[PDB]
Amino acid sequence: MIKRYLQFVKPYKYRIFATIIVGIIKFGIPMLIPLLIKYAIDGVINNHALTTDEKVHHLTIAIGIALFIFVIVRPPIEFIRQYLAQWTSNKILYDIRKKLYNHLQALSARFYANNQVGQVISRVINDVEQTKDFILTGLMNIWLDCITIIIALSIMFFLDVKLTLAALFIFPFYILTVYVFFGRLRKLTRERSQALAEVQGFLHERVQGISVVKSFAIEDNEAKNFDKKNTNFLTRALKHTRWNAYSFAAINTVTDIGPIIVIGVGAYLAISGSITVGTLAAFVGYLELLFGPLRRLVASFTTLTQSFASMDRVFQLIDEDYDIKNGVGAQPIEIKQGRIDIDHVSFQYNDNEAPILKDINLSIEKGETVAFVGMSGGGKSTLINLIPRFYDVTSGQILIDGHNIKDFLTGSLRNQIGLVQQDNILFSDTVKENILLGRPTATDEEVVEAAKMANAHDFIMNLPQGYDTEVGERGVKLSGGQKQRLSIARIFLNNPPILILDEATSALDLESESIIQEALDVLSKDRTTLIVAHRLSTITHADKIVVIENGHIVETGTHRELIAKQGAYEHLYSIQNL
C-alpha cells in the first residue's frame, strides 16, 4: 500500500530529494554557533601573541562572517526548506482529490443509495488531508533523524567499540515496543476518523433536512441524536488519546534506559582499567546525538501511525467497485431510430430481497409514445431507470436499435436519453446555469428557447435578476411548478432521440400543464417517448398505455381499447370523474 500512496508522490521525487538535501545542509548551521564561541575565546584572546588592533580586526571579520552566513545564507535555506516541503505535499493532496472526485462521479446509484454524503466527503477531505503528515514527517524528516543516528553511532564506534554496544542494547526493545503499539494505534485512529465521519454524515443530513426538524419542533429530540454521534466521536478520540499517551511514555522509558545503561557501563569500564577517562568524557558527550533522534522518532512514529489509518480509509473508498462498468466492448453508438426492446427483463435491487420487475416484455418502435401507469410502488420508475442503465437488469436484456444497452458507452447511452425524474434536482446556481446542465455548451439563445419551450422563460424574467437569478440551495427559491419546469427545459436543450418523463407534471397547475403538454406533444412528435404518469388524462393520447401491477405488466392498449376492456386500466381512470 505504501507503493500505492507513493504513486501520487512519484512526479515530485526530485522536489522531495531537494527538500531532504537542504534539510541536511541545516545541521551545519546550529554547529556554527559553538564554533564561533571558540574562535573569539581561543583565537583573539587566548592566543596571546596578537596586537590589540589586530585582534580587534579579526573579531570584525568573524563578527563579519557570522552575520553574513546568518543574515544572508541561512534565511534562503530556511525558506526554501519549508516552502518546498509544503508546496510539494499540498500539490500531492490536490492531486489525490482530483482523482477521488472522478472516482465518486463514477460510482453508481446503488453506492449512493447506501452511503452517507457527509461520510464520503469526510474521507475525500479529512482523511486525505491527514495523509499529509506521511509526506512531511515520513518522507522528509524521519531520514534526517536516522542520518543523525548513523553519524552518532559511527563517531561512537571509533571512540570505543564496546561503549557503543552499551547503547545499542536498548535499540531492539525500542523497536519491539513500537511494533507492539503501532497496530492498535492505527485502529484507534481509524475508528476515530470513522466517528468524525459519522458526525459529518449526521450534520449533512440534518442541516439539509431541517425543514422537517423545524416543522415538528423536534429540535430537542434531534439535538440529542446529535450528541450521541458527537459523544461517540469524543469517546473514540479519547481512547485514541489515552493510547498515544500510553505508548509515548513506553517507547521513551525504553529510550531513556539508553544513556543510563551507557553512563553506568562507561564508568565501570574507565575505572576498571578498560578505557581513557577522556574517552568516557568524549563519548558520553555524544549521548545527545543518539538518544535525541530516538526520542524524536517516537513522535515521528506516532504521527505516521495516524497517517496510515487515514490513507487506509482513503484507499478503502478508492477501492469501491463501479456497479455500472463500461467493459472492453464499449462503443459510442448513435441511436438513429428510437427502437427500444425489453426482453424478459427481471430486476432485483439486492440478492436477498424480492424482485421488483419480474418478467417484462415490451417493444417500443421509433416515434411511439408509451405511457406507464399503475398503483404507486409498482415498478414504473425502476423499469424506466433501467434504460439509462442506472442499474443493470438482473435477468434479461434491454436493446436500443438492436444494440444491448450494455454495449453502449455509458456517456453515449445516457446522453441520448433525455430524462426528467420525479424528484428533480437544482444546484445553488443561476436559473441559466441550471438549464445549462442539459447541454453545458449552449447558446444563451438556445437556453431561452428551451425555457420558452418549458413554459419557463416567462416567470424567469419576472425573477429578480432574471435568467441570472440565483435559485436557492437545492433550488429552494422557486415554486414546485417552477423547479419542475426548469427540469423540462433541460430536456429540450438536451434534445435527445429518446425522452423519458417520470411524472414530469407533478407540481404544475392545470393550466401550466396544458402548455407543457402542447410543448411536449410537439417535441414528442417523432421521438421515442416513455411516460410514467398518475394524472391519467395527460396520457390518453399515448400510442400505447402499459398498466403495471406488483412488478408486472397487467394490461396493454390504447386508451380507447383499455377503456372498453373494463379492466385494470378502466378501474383507475374510472376513479376520476366518478
Report 175-214 residues binding its own copies (CB under 8 A).
Answer: 196, 199-200, 203-214
Residue 277 binding its own copies, by CB under 8 A: yes
Residue 49 binding its own copies, by CB under 8 A: no
Residue 41 binding its own copies, by CB under 8 A: yes
Residue 461 binding its own copies, by CB under 8 A: no
Residue 249 binding its own copies, by CB under 8 A: yes
**What's the CA gap between 373 and 578, in Å, rounded?**
19
Nearest CA-CA partner of 555 in 372, 347, 345, 346:
372
Q: Which is nearer to its own copies, 311 or 493 (CB)?
A: 493
x/- map, 387-426, its own copies, by CB under 8 A = -x-x-------------------xxx-xx-x-x-xxxxx-
Q: 2-9 and 74-106 helices cross at what angle (nearest 10)? A: 110
**Amino acid symbol at 4:** R
Shortest separation between residue 83's beta carbon and its own copies, angstroms: 4
Which of these ranges, 48-56, 157-165, 339-347, 363-371, lies near its own copies under the rule CB under 8 A?
A: 48-56
Return the C-alpha cell found at 389: 442503465
Residue 268 binding its own copies, by CB under 8 A: yes
Shortest separation between residue 94's beta carbon and its own copies, angstroms: 4
What secondary structure letter does DSSP report for 565? T
Residues whose CB is less than 8 angstroms from the CB of residue 20 and which lie 6 or more positions away in sequence, other chains included: 140, 143, 144
Say whether 500 sits in a helix, a strand or coil: strand
Q: Which is nearer to its own copies, 263 or 343 (CB)?
A: 263
Q: Which is nearer to its own copies, 280 or 393 (CB)?
A: 280
**What's the CA gap between 374 and 222, in Å, rounded?**
37
Shortest separation between residue 100's beta carbon and its own copies, angstroms: 9
Residue 24 binding its own copies, by CB under 8 A: no
Residue 357 binding its own copies, by CB under 8 A: no
Residue 11 binding its own copies, by CB under 8 A: no
Q: Which of 537, 540, 556, 558 binds its own copies (CB under 8 A)?
A: 537
Residue 326 binding its own copies, by CB under 8 A: no
How far, in Å, are 1, 449, 457, 467, 524 from residue 445 at the CA level? Answer: 52, 6, 11, 12, 22
Say whether 177 sits in a helix, a strand or coil: helix
Which of these ranges, 15-23, 278-286, 315-323, 357-365, lies near its own copies under the rule CB under 8 A?
A: 278-286
Residue 427 binding its own copies, by CB under 8 A: yes
Q: Footprint of its own copies on residues 102-161 (CB under 8 A)? A: 102, 104-106, 109, 112-118, 120-121, 124-126
Q: In what order do the strands lie in the sheet with 417-420?
A: 417-420, 498-502, 528-532, 369-373, 544-549, 552-557
- Going 218 to 224 to 226 to 229, the CA torsion angle's sign is negative
Helices (H) and strands (E) in the chain, counts: 25, 10
* Half-sphere exposure (Cβ direction) of 84: Cα atoms closer than 13 Å: 21
Q: Footprint of its own copies on residues 50-109 (CB under 8 A)? A: 52, 55-56, 59, 63, 66-67, 70-71, 74-76, 78-80, 82-83, 86-87, 90-91, 94, 97-98, 101-102, 104-106, 109
Residue 171 binding its own copies, by CB under 8 A: no
Nearest CA-CA partner of 223 in 198, 195, 203:
203
Shortest separation between residue 348's beta carbon and its own copies, angstroms: 11
**What's the CA gap between 332 and 410, in Å, rounded?**
8
How many Cβ atoms from other residues are within 10 Å of residue 135's Cβ?
25
Q: Which is nearer to its own copies, 370 or 548 (CB)?
A: 548
Residue 244 binding its own copies, by CB under 8 A: yes
376: left (phi over 0), alpha (psi -120 to 50) or beta: beta
Shortest separation between residue 14's beta carbon and its own copies, angstroms: 18
Q: Which of 136, 153, 237, 563 binds its own copies (CB under 8 A)?
A: 237
Shortest separation between residue 276's beta carbon and its own copies, angstroms: 9
Shortest separation between residue 332's beta carbon and its own copies, angstroms: 11
CB-CB contact of 291 with 259 (8 Å): yes
